[PDB]
């Protein structure tokens, strides 16, 4: 058993399944999906924080944006819905009329994901399961249905792991003033003992009803409730040792860390297990304002996954469904594009470990990443070189044998000084899809 103390809970490390899974699907879905609107300003870490909340690209932040008068959201809202239309009202419009959890699960499985994590409660406080601690939930309003439970059953039937996201650090049902600047986050929070009990009871409830594979908390945990996590974590691990928690609780324990868009993104091997998350575009919740110009292309998604994995991370790619429960076409295509690439190259991703180094590049500027499976080293190019002669800078191999991954064809190579030279027959180079992949042994 795990005891309720940080020294004991440290005994639990990231489970194997999670380390080997490499790719998961995040799902931000709630009543904010109904208006599904945000100004696609840019990526977190690139937009100046003094403007960020006033032109928030996270459509799931709609309510906070609505609370800032004369913010693009306020104007959009007043003209589309009217001023006598409270944000809460969207809970009744959220009907998930076309939702089919098995179709979602089929899709995430085809895309190559091995786990799925929906938002059980985001910052607006709306709950997607029939919780008994609030009536502001999907069973009582809108969908008239236990979205979390139903999705978990479908995901698990498809053979994928199932986790839960819970906004522990923020709940706008307990505050009135919006977040205008990053500094505001230091005092505009529920702040009460009552809220801390609520959060604790809600996560314990999720654990008892669905025994998730991952407890993904966001925005930190209520200061008054931090001590509670020793008990919660021990309770959780003792019922599910292969369970896992992220690092957004603000306490000593975590099984894996996180990075969001540019924030805390590592440039080289970090030394611990971590997970990258971002939307296919610039938002997590659905944004009808985004076009393909704001989204990553299938090629960019593949290069992102490879970069992340060579660095020991897992990619948790977010999908932003519509209020009716359908997944926009732009998103579905990119999920599929990635699933296709993974069907061909998956063996150099799933189940791999990091190598001595994560990165390299060809004399001509083509970026390279490495992954490993025992004695096999995968050399993954972020693109496909034009010429048959490939010069990798600052790299020497002691393998003696280097094959072209898809075909398995042995290739010719030699360490020329501080570099490594390989000849890749154009026929092979033409077989690869987005990345030229080599395997050294």
Ligand X SMILES: C[C@@H]1N[C@H](CNC(=O)c2cc3ccccc3o2)[C@@H](O)[C@H](O)[C@@H]1O
Q: Which residues form the interface with ligand X (CB under 6 A)?
A: 28, 58, 60, 218-219, 248, 258-260, 263-264, 277, 284
Q: Which residue has the tokens 């957004």?
A: 248
Question: Closer to ligand X at the Cβ: 137 or 318?
Answer: 318
3-state secondary structure 301-321: HHHHHHHHHHCCEEEEEEECC
Residue 416's DSSP bridge partners are 419
Distance CA(107)–CA(236), nearest Å, equals: 29
Helix (H) or strand (E) holding 30: none
Contact code string over 205-244 relative to a copy of itself, x by CB under 8 A: ---x---------------x---x-xx--xx--xx-x---
Q: Which does 310 bind (CB under 5 to 8 A by kind): ligand X, a copy of itself, none?
A: none
DSSP designation for 147: H
**Residues whose CB falls within 8 Å of the CB of residue 434, separated by 6 or more in sequence, listed in order:** 298, 299, 302, 303, 341, 383, 384
Tell me the pairing of strands 389-392 and 419-423. Answer: antiparallel
Q: Which does 189 bind (CB under 5 to 8 A by kind): ligand X, a copy of itself, none?
A: a copy of itself
Q: Would you mind telling me the total number of residues written for the chain in this entry?
A: 441
201's tokens? 């009871």
Among 110, 173, 253, 344, binds a copy of itself (CB under 8 A): 253
Among 86, 97, 135, 194, binds a copy of itself (CB under 8 A): 194
Among 88, 103, 197, 299, binds a copy of itself (CB under 8 A): 197
Among 20, 226, 257, 361, binds a copy of itself (CB under 8 A): 257
Question: Closer to a copy of itself at the Cβ: 185 or 359?
Answer: 185
**Residues whose CB falls within 8 Å of the CB of residue 381, separated by 6 or more in sequence, listed in order:** 362, 366, 367, 368, 435, 436, 437, 438
Q: How far is the CB of 242 from a copy of itself (least distance, A)?
A: 11
174's tokens? 């307990």
Among 92, 135, 157, 177, binds a copy of itself (CB under 8 A): 177
Which residues in this chain contact a copy of itself in the complex, by CB under 8 A?
1, 3-4, 6-7, 10-13, 176-177, 181, 183-184, 186-189, 191-194, 196-197, 200-201, 208, 224, 228, 230-231, 234-235, 238-239, 241, 247, 250-254, 257, 270-272, 374-375
């Amino acid at each position: 058993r795990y005891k309720p103390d940080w020294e004991s809970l440290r005994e639990h490390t990231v489970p194997k399944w999670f380390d080997k899974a490499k790719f998961g699907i995040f799902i931000h879905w709630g009543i904010y999906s109904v208006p599904g609107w945000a100004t696609p300003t840019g990526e977190l870490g690139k937009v100046p924080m003094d403007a960020w909340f006033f032109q928030n690209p996270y459509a799931e932040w709609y309510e906070n944006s609505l609370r800032i008068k004369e913010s693009p959201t306020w104007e959009y809202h007043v003209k589309t819905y009217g001023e006598n239309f409270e944000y809460e009202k969207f809970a009744d419009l959220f009907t998930a009329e076309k939702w089919d959890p098995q179709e979602w699960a089929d899709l995430f499985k085809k895309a190559g994901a091995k786990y799925v994590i929906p938002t059980t409660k985001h910052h607006d406080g709306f709950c997607l399961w029939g919780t008994k601690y609030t009536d502001f939930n999907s069973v009582k309003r809108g969908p008239k249905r236990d979205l979390v439970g139903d999705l978990a059953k479908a995901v698990r039937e498809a053979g994928l792991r199932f986790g839960v996201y819970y906004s522990g650090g923020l709940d706008w049902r307990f505050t009135t003033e919006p977040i205008r600047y990053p500094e505001d986050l230091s005092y505009i929070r529920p702040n009460t003992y009552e809220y801390a009990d609520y959060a604790y009871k809600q996560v314990m409830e999720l654990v008892d009803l669905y025994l998730p594979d991952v407890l993904w908390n966001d925005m930190g945990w209520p200061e008054k409730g931090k001590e509670d996590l020793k008990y919660l974590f021990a309770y959780y691990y003792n019922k599910h040792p292969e369970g896992s928690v992220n690092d957004r609780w603000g306490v000593p324990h975590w099984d894996f860390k996180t990075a969001e868009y540019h924030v805390n993104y590592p440039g080289d091997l970090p030394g611990y297990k971590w997970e990258f998350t971002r939307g296919i575009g610039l938002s997590f919740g659905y944004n009808r304002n985004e076009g393909p110009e704001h989204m990553l292309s299938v090629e960019q998604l593949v290069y992102t996954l490879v970069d992340v994995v060579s660095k020991g991370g897992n990619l948790l790619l977010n999908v932003g469904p519509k209020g009716d429960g359908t997944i926009p076409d732009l998103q579905k295509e990119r999920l599929l594009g990635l699933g296709e690439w993974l069907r061909k190259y998956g063996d150099a991703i799933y189940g791999t470990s990091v190598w001595e180094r994560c990165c390299a590049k060809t004399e001509d500027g083509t970026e390279i990443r490495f992954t490993r499976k025992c004695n096999r080293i995968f050399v993954i190019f972020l693109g496909i070189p034009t010429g048959e002669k490939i010069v990798i800078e600052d790299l020497n191999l002691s393998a003696g044998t280097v094959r072209h991954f898809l075909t398995g064809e042995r290739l010719s190579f030699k360490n020329v000084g501080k570099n490594l030279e390989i000849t890749v027959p154009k026929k092979l180079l033409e077989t690869d899809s987005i990345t030229l992949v080599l395997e050294a042994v």
